[PDB]
Coordinates of C-alpha atoms and ligand atoms in Angstrom, one line a residue:
Chain A
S1 CA 30.4 212.4 125.7
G2 CA 34.0 213.2 126.4
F3 CA 35.5 213.2 129.9
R4 CA 37.6 216.0 131.3
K5 CA 39.3 216.8 134.6
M6 CA 36.4 219.2 135.5
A7 CA 36.5 221.7 138.5
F8 CA 33.5 223.2 140.1
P9 CA 32.4 226.6 138.9
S10 CA 34.5 228.9 141.2
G11 CA 32.3 232.0 141.2
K12 CA 31.0 231.3 144.8
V13 CA 34.4 231.0 146.1
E14 CA 35.8 234.0 144.1
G15 CA 33.4 236.2 146.0
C16 CA 35.1 235.3 149.3
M17 CA 38.7 236.0 148.5
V18 CA 40.5 238.8 150.1
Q19 CA 44.2 239.7 150.6
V20 CA 45.6 239.7 154.1
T21 CA 48.8 241.5 155.0
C22 CA 50.6 241.4 158.2
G23 CA 53.9 243.4 158.3
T24 CA 55.7 242.4 155.1
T25 CA 53.8 239.2 154.3
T26 CA 50.8 239.2 152.1
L27 CA 48.6 236.1 151.3
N28 CA 45.0 235.1 150.6
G29 CA 42.3 235.0 153.1
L30 CA 38.7 233.6 152.8
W31 CA 35.9 235.9 154.0
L32 CA 32.8 234.1 155.1
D33 CA 30.2 236.1 157.1
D34 CA 32.2 238.4 159.4
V35 CA 35.3 236.2 159.7
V36 CA 38.4 236.1 157.3
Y37 CA 40.3 232.8 157.7
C38 CA 44.1 232.7 156.5
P39 CA 47.2 230.7 157.3
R40 CA 48.7 231.8 160.5
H41 CA 52.2 232.1 158.9
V42 CA 51.0 235.6 157.6
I43 CA 52.4 236.8 161.0
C44 CA 56.0 235.5 160.2
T45 CA 59.0 237.1 158.6
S46 CA 61.4 234.7 156.5
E47 CA 63.6 234.6 159.6
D48 CA 60.7 233.5 161.7
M49 CA 59.7 230.5 159.5
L50 CA 62.8 228.4 160.5
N51 CA 61.1 227.6 163.9
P52 CA 58.2 230.0 164.6
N53 CA 56.8 230.5 168.0
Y54 CA 53.3 231.4 166.6
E55 CA 51.9 232.1 170.2
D56 CA 54.6 234.7 170.8
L57 CA 54.6 236.1 167.3
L58 CA 50.8 236.6 167.5
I59 CA 51.1 238.5 170.8
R60 CA 53.1 241.1 169.2
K61 CA 50.2 241.8 166.7
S62 CA 47.0 243.9 167.2
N63 CA 43.7 243.9 165.1
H64 CA 45.0 247.0 163.3
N65 CA 48.3 245.3 162.1
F66 CA 46.1 242.8 159.9
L67 CA 45.4 244.6 156.8
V68 CA 42.4 242.9 154.8
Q69 CA 41.4 244.2 151.5
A70 CA 38.4 242.8 149.6
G71 CA 39.5 243.9 146.1
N72 CA 38.9 247.6 146.3
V73 CA 37.9 247.9 149.9
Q74 CA 39.4 247.7 153.3
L75 CA 37.9 245.6 156.0
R76 CA 37.8 246.8 159.6
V77 CA 39.5 244.0 161.9
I78 CA 37.8 244.0 165.4
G79 CA 39.2 240.6 166.7
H80 CA 41.8 238.1 166.0
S81 CA 42.5 234.5 167.0
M82 CA 44.5 231.5 166.2
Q83 CA 43.0 228.1 165.8
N84 CA 45.4 225.4 165.1
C85 CA 47.4 226.7 162.0
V86 CA 44.8 229.3 160.8
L87 CA 44.1 232.8 161.9
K88 CA 40.5 233.9 162.1
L89 CA 40.2 237.8 161.9
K90 CA 36.7 238.9 162.9
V91 CA 35.7 241.9 160.7
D92 CA 32.9 244.4 161.2
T93 CA 31.2 243.7 158.0
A94 CA 29.7 240.2 156.9
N95 CA 30.7 239.4 153.3
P96 CA 27.6 240.2 151.2
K97 CA 28.8 237.4 148.7
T98 CA 29.0 234.7 151.4
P99 CA 27.6 231.6 149.8
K100 CA 25.8 228.8 151.7
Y101 CA 28.9 226.9 153.0
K102 CA 30.2 224.1 155.4
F103 CA 33.7 223.3 156.6
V104 CA 34.6 219.7 156.0
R105 CA 37.6 217.6 156.5
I106 CA 37.9 215.3 153.4
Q107 CA 39.4 211.9 153.2
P108 CA 42.5 211.0 151.4
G109 CA 41.5 209.8 147.9
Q110 CA 38.6 212.3 147.6
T111 CA 38.8 215.1 145.1
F112 CA 38.1 218.9 145.2
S113 CA 38.7 222.1 143.1
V114 CA 41.3 224.6 144.0
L115 CA 40.9 228.3 143.3
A116 CA 44.5 229.5 143.0
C117 CA 44.9 233.1 144.1
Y118 CA 47.5 235.7 144.5
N119 CA 47.2 238.9 146.5
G120 CA 43.4 238.1 147.0
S121 CA 42.9 237.7 143.3
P122 CA 41.8 234.5 141.6
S123 CA 44.2 233.3 138.8
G124 CA 42.8 229.9 137.9
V125 CA 40.8 226.8 138.9
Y126 CA 41.8 223.2 138.8
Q127 CA 40.6 219.9 140.1
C128 CA 43.0 217.7 142.1
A129 CA 42.9 214.7 144.6
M130 CA 44.0 214.7 148.2
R131 CA 46.7 211.9 147.8
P132 CA 46.6 208.9 150.2
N133 CA 49.6 210.4 151.9
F134 CA 47.8 213.8 152.5
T135 CA 49.7 215.9 150.0
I136 CA 48.1 217.4 147.0
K137 CA 50.0 217.8 143.6
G138 CA 48.8 221.3 143.0
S139 CA 50.1 224.3 141.0
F140 CA 51.1 227.0 143.6
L141 CA 53.7 229.7 143.7
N142 CA 54.8 232.1 146.4
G143 CA 51.7 234.2 147.4
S144 CA 49.2 231.3 146.7
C145 CA 49.0 230.6 150.6
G146 CA 45.5 230.8 151.8
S147 CA 44.1 229.6 148.4
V148 CA 41.3 227.1 149.1
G149 CA 40.0 223.8 148.0
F150 CA 36.3 223.0 147.9
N151 CA 33.4 221.0 146.6
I152 CA 29.8 222.3 145.7
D153 CA 26.5 220.4 146.4
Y154 CA 23.9 222.6 144.4
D155 CA 24.2 226.0 146.4
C156 CA 26.4 224.7 149.2
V157 CA 30.2 225.2 149.1
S158 CA 31.9 222.7 151.4
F159 CA 35.5 224.1 152.0
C160 CA 37.9 221.4 152.6
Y161 CA 41.4 222.9 152.1
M162 CA 43.5 225.8 152.7
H163 CA 46.9 225.9 151.2
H164 CA 49.9 226.5 153.4
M165 CA 53.1 225.1 152.1
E166 CA 55.2 223.6 149.3
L167 CA 57.4 220.8 150.5
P168 CA 61.0 220.6 149.3
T169 CA 59.7 217.9 146.9
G170 CA 57.4 220.4 145.1
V171 CA 54.3 218.8 146.4
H172 CA 51.7 220.7 148.5
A173 CA 50.5 220.7 152.1
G174 CA 47.6 222.4 153.9
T175 CA 45.0 222.4 156.3
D176 CA 41.1 221.9 156.7
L177 CA 39.3 225.2 157.5
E178 CA 39.8 224.7 161.3
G179 CA 43.6 224.9 160.7
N180 CA 44.4 221.2 161.1
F181 CA 46.9 220.0 158.7
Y182 CA 46.2 217.2 156.4
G183 CA 49.1 214.6 157.0
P184 CA 52.0 215.0 159.3
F185 CA 53.0 218.4 158.3
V186 CA 53.9 221.4 160.5
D187 CA 54.1 225.1 159.3
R188 CA 57.8 225.4 159.5
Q189 CA 60.7 225.8 157.0
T190 CA 62.0 222.3 157.8
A191 CA 62.4 219.4 155.4
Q192 CA 59.4 217.1 156.2
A193 CA 58.6 213.5 155.2
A194 CA 55.4 212.9 153.2
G195 CA 54.4 209.3 153.7
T196 CA 54.7 206.6 151.0
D197 CA 52.0 207.4 148.5
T198 CA 49.6 204.9 146.6
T199 CA 47.4 205.0 143.7
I200 CA 43.7 205.5 144.5
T201 CA 42.3 202.1 143.2
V202 CA 38.6 203.0 143.5
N203 CA 39.3 206.2 141.5
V204 CA 41.0 204.3 138.7
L205 CA 38.1 201.8 138.5
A206 CA 35.6 204.6 138.2
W207 CA 37.8 206.3 135.5
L208 CA 37.7 202.9 133.8
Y209 CA 33.9 202.9 133.9
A210 CA 33.9 206.6 132.6
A211 CA 36.0 205.3 129.7
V212 CA 33.6 202.5 128.8
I213 CA 30.6 205.0 129.1
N214 CA 32.5 207.3 126.7
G215 CA 33.4 204.6 124.1
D216 CA 37.0 203.6 125.1
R217 CA 36.7 199.9 125.7
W218 CA 39.8 198.2 124.1
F219 CA 40.9 197.3 127.8
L220 CA 37.9 195.1 128.5
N221 CA 38.8 191.5 128.6
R222 CA 37.3 188.0 129.0
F223 CA 38.5 187.8 132.6
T224 CA 37.3 188.2 136.0
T225 CA 39.1 188.2 139.4
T226 CA 38.5 188.2 143.1
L227 CA 39.2 190.9 145.7
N228 CA 42.0 188.6 147.2
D229 CA 43.7 188.0 143.9
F230 CA 43.1 191.7 142.7
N231 CA 44.6 192.8 146.0
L232 CA 47.9 190.7 145.5
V233 CA 48.3 192.8 142.2
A234 CA 47.3 196.0 143.9
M235 CA 50.0 195.4 146.5
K236 CA 52.6 194.8 143.9
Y237 CA 51.9 197.8 142.0
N238 CA 51.4 200.1 145.0
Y239 CA 47.6 200.4 144.6
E240 CA 45.3 200.9 147.7
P241 CA 43.9 197.5 148.6
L242 CA 40.2 197.4 147.3
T243 CA 37.5 196.7 149.9
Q244 CA 33.7 196.0 149.8
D245 CA 33.0 199.6 150.6
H246 CA 34.8 200.7 147.3
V247 CA 32.9 197.9 145.5
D248 CA 29.7 199.2 146.9
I249 CA 30.4 202.9 145.8
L250 CA 31.2 201.6 142.3
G251 CA 27.7 200.0 142.1
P252 CA 25.9 202.8 140.2
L253 CA 28.8 202.5 137.6
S254 CA 28.5 198.8 137.4
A255 CA 24.7 199.0 136.9
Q256 CA 25.0 201.6 134.2
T257 CA 27.5 199.7 132.2
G258 CA 26.5 196.2 133.1
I259 CA 30.1 195.4 134.0
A260 CA 30.5 193.8 137.3
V261 CA 33.1 195.4 139.6
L262 CA 35.3 192.3 139.8
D263 CA 35.2 192.0 135.9
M264 CA 36.5 195.7 135.8
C265 CA 39.1 194.7 138.4
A266 CA 40.4 192.0 136.0
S267 CA 40.7 194.7 133.3
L268 CA 42.7 196.9 135.8
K269 CA 44.8 193.8 136.7
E270 CA 45.7 193.2 133.2
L271 CA 46.5 196.8 132.6
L272 CA 48.8 196.9 135.6
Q273 CA 50.6 193.8 134.6
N274 CA 50.9 194.6 130.8
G275 CA 50.8 198.4 130.6
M276 CA 48.8 200.2 127.9
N277 CA 51.0 198.9 124.9
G278 CA 51.2 202.4 123.5
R279 CA 47.4 203.0 123.7
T280 CA 45.4 205.6 125.4
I281 CA 42.1 205.6 127.7
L282 CA 40.3 209.0 127.7
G283 CA 43.3 210.7 126.1
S284 CA 45.6 209.6 129.0
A285 CA 48.6 207.1 128.6
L286 CA 48.5 206.3 132.4
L287 CA 45.9 205.0 134.8
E288 CA 44.1 208.0 136.1
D289 CA 43.2 208.3 139.8
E290 CA 41.7 211.8 140.3
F291 CA 38.3 211.0 139.6
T292 CA 36.0 209.4 142.3
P293 CA 33.0 207.3 141.6
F294 CA 30.8 210.2 142.4
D295 CA 32.8 212.5 140.0
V296 CA 32.3 210.1 137.2
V297 CA 28.5 209.9 137.9
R298 CA 28.2 213.7 138.2
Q299 CA 30.0 214.4 135.0
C300 CA 28.3 211.5 133.0
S301 CA 24.8 212.7 134.2
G302 CA 25.2 216.5 133.9
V303 CA 24.7 217.6 137.6
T304 CA 24.5 221.4 138.2
Chain B
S1 CA 55.9 224.7 141.5
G2 CA 53.6 222.1 140.0
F3 CA 51.8 222.5 136.6
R4 CA 48.1 221.8 136.2
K5 CA 45.5 222.0 133.4
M6 CA 44.1 225.2 134.9
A7 CA 41.0 226.9 133.8
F8 CA 40.3 230.6 134.2
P9 CA 38.0 231.5 137.3
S10 CA 34.5 231.2 135.9
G11 CA 32.6 233.5 138.1
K12 CA 32.5 236.4 135.5
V13 CA 30.8 233.9 133.1
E14 CA 28.5 232.2 135.6
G15 CA 26.8 235.6 136.1
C16 CA 25.9 235.6 132.4
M17 CA 24.3 232.1 132.1
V18 CA 20.6 231.9 131.4
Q19 CA 18.1 229.1 130.3
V20 CA 16.4 229.6 126.9
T21 CA 13.5 227.4 126.0
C22 CA 11.7 227.6 122.7
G23 CA 8.8 225.2 122.4
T24 CA 10.0 221.8 123.7
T25 CA 13.8 222.7 123.4
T26 CA 15.8 224.1 126.3
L27 CA 19.4 225.1 126.1
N28 CA 21.9 227.7 127.6
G29 CA 22.0 231.2 126.7
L30 CA 24.7 234.0 127.3
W31 CA 23.2 237.3 128.8
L32 CA 25.5 240.3 128.1
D33 CA 24.0 243.8 128.4
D34 CA 20.5 243.5 127.0
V35 CA 21.1 240.6 124.6
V36 CA 20.9 236.9 125.2
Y37 CA 22.9 234.9 122.8
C38 CA 22.2 231.1 122.1
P39 CA 22.5 228.4 119.4
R40 CA 19.8 228.9 116.8
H41 CA 18.9 225.3 116.9
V42 CA 16.8 226.1 120.1
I43 CA 13.9 226.8 117.5
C44 CA 14.0 223.2 116.2
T45 CA 12.3 220.0 117.3
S46 CA 14.1 216.6 116.9
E47 CA 12.3 216.1 113.5
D48 CA 13.5 219.5 112.3
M49 CA 17.4 218.7 112.9
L50 CA 17.7 216.4 109.9
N51 CA 17.6 219.4 107.5
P52 CA 16.3 222.6 109.2
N53 CA 15.3 225.6 107.3
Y54 CA 16.2 228.1 110.1
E55 CA 14.9 231.1 108.2
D56 CA 11.4 229.4 108.1
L57 CA 11.5 227.9 111.5
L58 CA 12.3 231.2 113.0
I59 CA 9.4 233.1 111.0
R60 CA 7.0 230.8 113.0
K61 CA 8.4 232.2 116.3
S62 CA 7.6 235.4 118.2
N63 CA 9.4 237.1 121.0
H64 CA 7.0 235.7 123.4
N65 CA 7.9 232.1 122.3
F66 CA 11.5 232.6 123.7
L67 CA 11.4 231.8 127.4
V68 CA 14.5 233.2 129.1
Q69 CA 15.1 232.6 132.7
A70 CA 18.0 234.0 134.8
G71 CA 18.0 231.6 137.5
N72 CA 14.9 232.7 139.4
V73 CA 13.6 235.5 137.2
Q74 CA 12.0 235.7 133.8
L75 CA 13.5 238.0 131.2
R76 CA 11.1 240.0 128.8
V77 CA 12.1 239.3 125.2
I78 CA 11.6 242.5 123.1
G79 CA 13.4 241.5 119.9
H80 CA 14.9 238.4 118.1
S81 CA 17.2 237.9 115.2
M82 CA 19.4 235.3 113.6
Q83 CA 23.1 236.0 113.0
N84 CA 24.7 233.0 111.3
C85 CA 24.0 230.0 113.6
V86 CA 23.2 232.1 116.8
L87 CA 20.0 233.8 117.9
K88 CA 20.2 237.1 119.6
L89 CA 17.3 237.8 121.8
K90 CA 16.9 241.5 122.9
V91 CA 15.7 241.6 126.4
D92 CA 14.3 244.8 128.2
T93 CA 16.8 244.4 131.1
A94 CA 20.7 244.8 130.9
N95 CA 22.4 242.0 132.9
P96 CA 23.6 243.6 136.1
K97 CA 26.4 241.1 136.2
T98 CA 27.7 241.8 132.8
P99 CA 31.5 241.8 132.9
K100 CA 33.8 243.8 130.7
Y101 CA 33.8 241.5 127.6
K102 CA 34.9 241.1 123.9
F103 CA 33.8 238.6 121.3
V104 CA 36.9 237.1 119.8
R105 CA 37.4 234.3 117.1
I106 CA 40.3 232.2 118.2
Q107 CA 43.0 230.5 116.2
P108 CA 43.4 226.8 116.0
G109 CA 45.9 225.7 118.6
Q110 CA 44.8 228.5 121.1
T111 CA 43.3 227.3 124.4
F112 CA 40.2 228.5 126.5
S113 CA 38.1 227.6 129.4
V114 CA 34.7 226.1 129.0
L115 CA 32.1 226.6 131.6
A116 CA 29.7 223.6 131.0
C117 CA 26.1 224.4 131.8
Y118 CA 22.7 222.6 131.8
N119 CA 19.4 224.4 132.0
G120 CA 21.3 227.7 132.5
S121 CA 23.1 226.3 135.6
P122 CA 26.9 226.0 135.5
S123 CA 28.1 222.4 136.3
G124 CA 31.9 222.6 135.8
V125 CA 34.8 224.3 134.2
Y126 CA 37.7 222.8 132.2
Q127 CA 40.6 224.0 130.1
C128 CA 40.8 222.7 126.5
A129 CA 42.4 223.6 123.0
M130 CA 40.7 224.4 119.8
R131 CA 42.1 221.5 117.8
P132 CA 44.0 222.4 114.4
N133 CA 40.9 220.8 112.7
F134 CA 38.6 223.2 114.6
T135 CA 37.0 220.7 116.9
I136 CA 37.2 220.6 120.6
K137 CA 37.5 217.5 122.8
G138 CA 35.1 218.7 125.5
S139 CA 32.9 217.0 128.0
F140 CA 29.3 217.9 126.9
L141 CA 26.0 216.0 127.2
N142 CA 22.6 216.8 125.9
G143 CA 21.4 220.2 127.3
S144 CA 24.9 221.6 127.2
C145 CA 24.4 223.5 124.0
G146 CA 25.0 227.3 124.5
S147 CA 27.8 226.7 127.0
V148 CA 30.6 229.1 126.2
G149 CA 34.5 229.0 126.1
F150 CA 36.3 232.2 127.1
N151 CA 39.7 233.7 128.1
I152 CA 40.2 236.4 130.7
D153 CA 42.7 239.3 130.5
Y154 CA 42.5 241.0 134.0
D155 CA 38.8 242.1 134.2
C156 CA 38.0 241.5 130.4
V157 CA 36.3 238.2 129.4
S158 CA 36.9 237.4 125.7
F159 CA 34.2 235.0 124.7
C160 CA 35.5 232.7 121.8
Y161 CA 33.2 229.7 121.7
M162 CA 29.5 228.6 122.0
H163 CA 28.9 224.8 122.0
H164 CA 26.4 223.6 119.4
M165 CA 27.1 220.1 118.5
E166 CA 28.5 216.7 119.2
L167 CA 29.8 215.0 116.1
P168 CA 29.1 211.2 115.6
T169 CA 32.8 210.7 116.7
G170 CA 32.1 212.2 120.1
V171 CA 34.1 215.3 119.5
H172 CA 32.6 218.8 119.7
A173 CA 31.8 221.7 117.5
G174 CA 30.6 225.2 117.8
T175 CA 30.8 228.7 116.8
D176 CA 32.4 232.1 117.6
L177 CA 29.8 234.6 119.4
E178 CA 28.7 235.9 116.0
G179 CA 27.5 232.4 115.1
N180 CA 30.0 231.4 112.7
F181 CA 31.1 227.7 113.1
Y182 CA 34.8 226.9 113.7
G183 CA 35.6 224.5 111.0
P184 CA 33.4 223.1 108.2
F185 CA 30.5 222.2 110.4
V186 CA 26.8 222.9 109.8
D187 CA 24.1 222.8 112.4
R188 CA 22.3 219.8 111.1
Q189 CA 21.9 216.1 112.2
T190 CA 24.1 214.8 109.4
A191 CA 27.4 212.8 109.7
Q192 CA 30.2 215.4 109.1
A193 CA 33.8 215.0 108.4
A194 CA 36.3 216.8 110.9
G195 CA 39.5 217.4 109.0
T196 CA 42.7 215.4 109.7
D197 CA 43.9 216.7 113.1
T198 CA 47.5 217.4 114.1
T199 CA 49.5 217.8 117.3
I200 CA 50.1 221.5 118.3
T201 CA 53.9 221.4 118.2
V202 CA 54.4 224.9 119.7
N203 CA 52.2 223.9 122.8
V204 CA 54.1 220.7 123.3
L205 CA 57.4 222.8 123.2
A206 CA 55.9 225.2 125.7
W207 CA 54.8 222.3 128.0
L208 CA 58.4 220.9 127.8
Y209 CA 59.6 224.3 129.0
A210 CA 57.0 224.2 131.8
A211 CA 58.4 220.7 132.6
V212 CA 62.0 222.0 133.0
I213 CA 60.9 225.0 135.1
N214 CA 59.0 222.5 137.3
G215 CA 61.9 220.1 137.7
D216 CA 61.2 217.4 135.1
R217 CA 64.2 217.4 133.0
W218 CA 65.2 213.7 132.2
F219 CA 64.2 214.4 128.5
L220 CA 66.9 217.1 128.0
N221 CA 69.7 215.8 125.8
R222 CA 73.0 216.8 124.3
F223 CA 71.5 217.4 120.8
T224 CA 70.3 220.2 118.7
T225 CA 68.3 220.3 115.5
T226 CA 67.3 222.7 112.7
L227 CA 63.6 223.9 111.7
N228 CA 64.0 221.9 108.6
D229 CA 65.4 218.7 110.3
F230 CA 62.8 219.1 113.1
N231 CA 60.0 219.6 110.5
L232 CA 60.8 216.3 108.7
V233 CA 60.1 214.6 112.2
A234 CA 57.1 216.7 112.8
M235 CA 55.8 215.6 109.4
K236 CA 56.3 211.8 110.1
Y237 CA 54.6 212.1 113.6
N238 CA 51.7 214.4 112.5
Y239 CA 52.7 217.4 114.2
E240 CA 52.3 220.9 113.0
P241 CA 55.3 222.3 111.1
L242 CA 57.2 224.7 113.4
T243 CA 57.8 228.2 112.0
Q244 CA 59.8 231.2 113.1
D245 CA 56.7 232.8 114.5
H246 CA 56.4 229.7 116.9
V247 CA 60.0 230.1 117.8
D248 CA 59.5 233.8 118.6
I249 CA 56.6 233.1 120.9
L250 CA 58.7 230.6 122.8
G251 CA 61.4 233.2 123.3
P252 CA 60.3 234.2 126.9
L253 CA 60.4 230.4 127.9
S254 CA 63.8 230.0 126.1
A255 CA 65.2 233.0 128.0
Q256 CA 63.8 231.9 131.4
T257 CA 65.3 228.5 131.0
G258 CA 68.4 229.2 129.0
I259 CA 67.5 226.3 126.7
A260 CA 67.6 227.4 123.0
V261 CA 64.3 226.7 121.2
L262 CA 66.1 224.4 118.6
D263 CA 67.7 222.5 121.5
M264 CA 64.1 221.9 123.0
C265 CA 63.1 220.8 119.5
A266 CA 65.9 218.2 119.6
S267 CA 64.5 216.8 123.0
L268 CA 61.0 216.8 121.3
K269 CA 62.5 215.0 118.3
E270 CA 64.0 212.3 120.5
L271 CA 60.9 211.9 122.4
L272 CA 58.9 211.5 119.1
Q273 CA 61.3 208.9 117.7
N274 CA 61.8 206.9 121.1
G275 CA 58.6 207.5 123.2
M276 CA 58.7 208.1 127.0
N277 CA 60.2 204.5 127.9
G278 CA 57.8 204.2 130.6
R279 CA 58.5 207.6 132.1
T280 CA 56.3 210.6 132.7
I281 CA 56.5 214.4 132.2
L282 CA 54.5 216.6 134.5
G283 CA 52.3 213.6 135.4
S284 CA 51.6 212.7 131.7
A285 CA 52.8 209.6 129.9
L286 CA 52.1 211.4 126.5
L287 CA 53.1 214.7 124.9
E288 CA 50.8 217.3 126.0
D289 CA 49.6 220.0 123.5
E290 CA 46.9 221.9 125.4
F291 CA 49.1 224.6 126.9
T292 CA 50.1 227.6 124.9
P293 CA 53.4 229.4 125.5
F294 CA 51.2 232.2 127.1
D295 CA 49.6 229.7 129.4
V296 CA 52.9 228.3 130.5
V297 CA 54.2 231.9 131.3
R298 CA 50.9 233.0 133.1
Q299 CA 50.9 229.7 135.1
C300 CA 54.6 229.9 135.9
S301 CA 54.5 233.7 137.0
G302 CA 51.1 233.7 138.8
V303 CA 49.0 236.2 136.7
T304 CA 45.6 237.1 138.2
Ligands
NB6_1 C1 56.9 229.1 147.7 C2 55.5 228.4 147.8 C3 55.0 227.8 146.6 C4 53.9 227.1 146.6 N1 53.1 227.0 147.7 C5 53.5 227.7 148.8 C6 54.6 228.4 148.8 N2 55.2 229.0 150.2 C7 55.6 228.3 151.1 O1 55.8 227.2 151.2 C8 56.2 229.4 152.2 C9 56.3 228.6 153.6 C10 57.5 228.1 154.0 C11 57.5 227.2 155.2 C12 56.4 226.9 155.9 C13 55.2 227.4 155.3 BR1 53.6 227.1 156.4 C14 55.2 228.2 154.3
NB6_2 C1 23.8 215.2 122.7 C2 24.9 216.2 122.7 C3 26.1 216.0 123.5 C4 27.1 217.0 123.5 N1 26.9 218.1 122.8 C5 25.8 218.4 122.2 C6 24.8 217.6 122.1 N2 23.7 217.9 121.3 C7 23.6 217.9 120.0 O1 24.6 217.7 119.3 C8 22.2 218.2 119.3 C9 22.4 218.6 117.9 C10 22.2 217.7 116.9 C11 22.5 218.0 115.6 C12 22.9 219.4 115.2 C13 23.1 220.2 116.4 BR1 23.5 222.0 116.0 C14 22.7 219.9 117.7

């Protein structure tokens, strides 16, 4: 029992972190096999970031300008290329600590762990969700660029995020491991609109199921609702509309607790319309949307 | 910017986890140098747990009864001893992945990361506080016993907790790495009173400082208070009385923000007396007490 915002064990990812320096800029790189991946803005000075011409800035750089240090040791760079917003530095040595890995583009509303790093050194690990508007509300400071987000399925690390930027609003933006930004962002020091965000309804329902499993049940009521009725309330409260695909992924939690998904929707409806009345659910005084149904099952069954 | 409940990177601790089996019971062990530490209740059956005579139960066990497996490989047990509520199994091989480490007994109100494990395999990492009543509100299931809590100071892991038990209230109890329980608990299947808990005042103030640093400042007011006046409010709201030692550790945060500690106390006083009025601070709708002043400084400066 108990339910926490749990991150994946970060060890497999710590073994891949390196520091990449190009000129006066230092950030984090991810060393997998014989390639180091890092944000392409490592080639910019502060002056360049207002409107960088990355193709031109990269043409002035040679393999020997990219200083890659794996803690104690220096890596020899034998190739460089830009793919979207990431640089790929081919090194002459495959990382001996490379775990089994995949590069995946996650969907908005999915969660992942972030290993925040500075100068190629891991500082901390936290779990977060990719917001429906493709931003993440992380904890990142200058030098954290190149820190990665990931999930783990037994021995396989699926890398889904590389940190690039903090928006003027204090929220975070980055790319998949092929250098494609999540959302409409560009790697430039320009104010950029993040879309209207929404609350991840299916995650809130999964978390209400986690609450019932762990003994917090005051919010259960004698009511039920329909997808249509629930979606009118979801609309009013800026929640994602619930679909049958979301109901389907909540099936295991509905089966484990015996609480039909639409009955849990009626509890969520009442919580939206009435608030918490000064009470808490799993130590929170608000509706939590950073746990997916898979996260709740994994945490509630003890998956390693 | 941004502020998250960040755990330490767990890699150094993942390399120490092993599975320990004695008869029909399997739990986690911590392998450091040539010793494996685990909860002594690994020697009990379910029948034994109602009132175990650990000295007698351990006398029926030999070195060969303790099956220790470090993932793939079996460790050869050449000695066993009980120290308080932990067993120490001497193995013939020093763990090659042993990090620089210390065993420390943490104070109530201090925080640490937990690497939750099952069958010697890490499942997740989360940050938590040792409650003033010496319980922890973790996320643990059957098989998690032997999972450890720790802090890291550059390359040194200070192990402070080993999980033993879930109280009938769903909260967690365990020991330091010398097998001494935190709090009044005993390793027996008996209902046990955890003391009256309190909110960790110095941590809430540190978190209010983290909020101001990260832009959440609506709660700042035109008031100040005294330690005596603040402590009357702390008393009413079941918060730990604030002392000069707590004011002193908040000095760096007071200096960084220019907000005197007693002025932050007056904001906390108003929040206690009025609530949040439906607003949030750092994404929370309640007053958070799981960040120490050191945690806030570390997170807000980017320490690796
Ligand atoms: C200072 C900071 C804090 C947190 N995360 C990231 C940062 N750094 C930046 O945002 C630098 C930067 C500026 C403009 C475009 C790009 Br791409 C990168
Ligand atoms: C089932 C579970 C869940 C979470 N953490 C721990 C557990 N396991 C236990 O508490 C088993 C146990 C029973 C009585 C005394 C002692 Br010492 C240990």
